[PDB]
Design an enzyme around this catalytic site. Structure first.
Site, PDB file in Angstrom:
ATOM      1  N   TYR A  26       0.827  -1.192   0.000  1.00 12.84           N
ATOM      2  CA  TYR A  26       0.000   0.000   0.000  1.00 12.84           C
ATOM      3  C   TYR A  26       0.869   1.253   0.000  1.00 12.84           C
ATOM      4  CZ  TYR A  26       0.794   0.323   5.091  1.00 12.84           C
ATOM      5  OH  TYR A  26       1.355   0.436   6.344  1.00 12.84           O
ATOM      6  N   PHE A  36       1.749  10.125   4.112  1.00 11.17           N
ATOM      7  CA  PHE A  36       1.766   9.836   5.537  1.00 11.17           C
ATOM      8  C   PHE A  36       2.077   8.387   5.861  1.00 11.17           C
ATOM      9  CE2 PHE A  36      -2.313   7.628   5.913  1.00 11.17           C
ATOM     10  CZ  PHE A  36      -2.972   8.048   4.776  1.00 11.17           C
ATOM     11  N   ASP A  37       2.025   7.470   4.901  1.00  9.07           N
ATOM     12  CA  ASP A  37       2.321   6.077   5.190  1.00  9.07           C
ATOM     13  C   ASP A  37       2.760   5.402   3.902  1.00  9.07           C
ATOM     14  OD1 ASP A  37       2.676   3.689   6.478  1.00  9.07           O
ATOM     15  OD2 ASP A  37       0.569   3.386   7.005  1.00  9.07           O
ATOM     16  N   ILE A  56      -9.157  -0.690   8.509  1.00 14.40           N
ATOM     17  CA  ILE A  56     -10.381   0.102   8.453  1.00 14.40           C
ATOM     18  C   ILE A  56     -11.347  -0.476   7.420  1.00 14.40           C
ATOM     19  CG2 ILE A  56      -9.188   2.157   9.233  1.00 14.40           C
ATOM     20  CD1 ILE A  56      -9.085   3.004   6.278  1.00 14.40           C
ATOM     21  N   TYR A  82     -11.886   7.595   9.703  1.00 14.38           N
ATOM     22  CA  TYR A  82     -11.538   8.301  10.931  1.00 14.38           C
ATOM     23  C   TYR A  82     -12.343   9.571  11.183  1.00 14.38           C
ATOM     24  CZ  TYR A  82      -7.358   5.323  11.122  1.00 14.38           C
ATOM     25  OH  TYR A  82      -6.497   4.252  11.174  1.00 14.38           O
ATOM     26  N   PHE A  99      -5.381   6.131  -1.592  1.00 18.05           N
ATOM     27  CA  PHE A  99      -4.467   5.001  -1.495  1.00 18.05           C
ATOM     28  C   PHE A  99      -4.079   4.489  -2.869  1.00 18.05           C
ATOM     29  CE2 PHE A  99      -6.720   4.776   2.554  1.00 18.05           C
ATOM     30  CZ  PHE A  99      -5.660   4.689   3.432  1.00 18.05           C
TER      31      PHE A  99
END
Length: 107
Positions: A26, A36-37, A56, A82, A99
């Site tokens: 991912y 962020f990731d 999630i 979120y 994503f």
């Protein structure tokens, strides 16, 4: 609200099912924001299973709507990830998630 915009290649028939553990490269992205990731950085491509509410809900429906080798493009609503609370210090409240997801699994 799961919107898939598929980068083509793969097979499109080996679908993930219940009781299966799948592997995803991912890549996170904030809308009008930075990264962020990234599982591409840590080089441990995030082995996880299906149906235990580990990830999630917006990412959970996206994994079932792919196949082996595919390369999707998620777009999640705030209410599935979120948006009421917001993950503290990392995701602001009422946020929209982007994503890049490539599924290269086993099983």
């Amino acid at each position: 609200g799961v919107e898939i915009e598929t980068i083509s290649p793969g097979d499109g028939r080996t679908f993930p099912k219940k009781g299966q553990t799948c592997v995803v490269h991912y890549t996170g992205m904030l809308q009008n924001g930075k990264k962020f990731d990234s599982s591409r950085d840590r080089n441990k491509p995030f082995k996880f299973r299906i149906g235990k509410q580990e990830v999630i809900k917006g990412f959970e429906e996206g994994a079932a709507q792919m196949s082996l080798g595919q390369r999707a493009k998620l777009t999640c609503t705030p209410d599935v990830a979120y948006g009421a609370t917001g993950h503290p210090g990392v995701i602001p409240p009422n946020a929209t998630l982007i994503f890049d997801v490539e599924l290269l699994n086993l099983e």
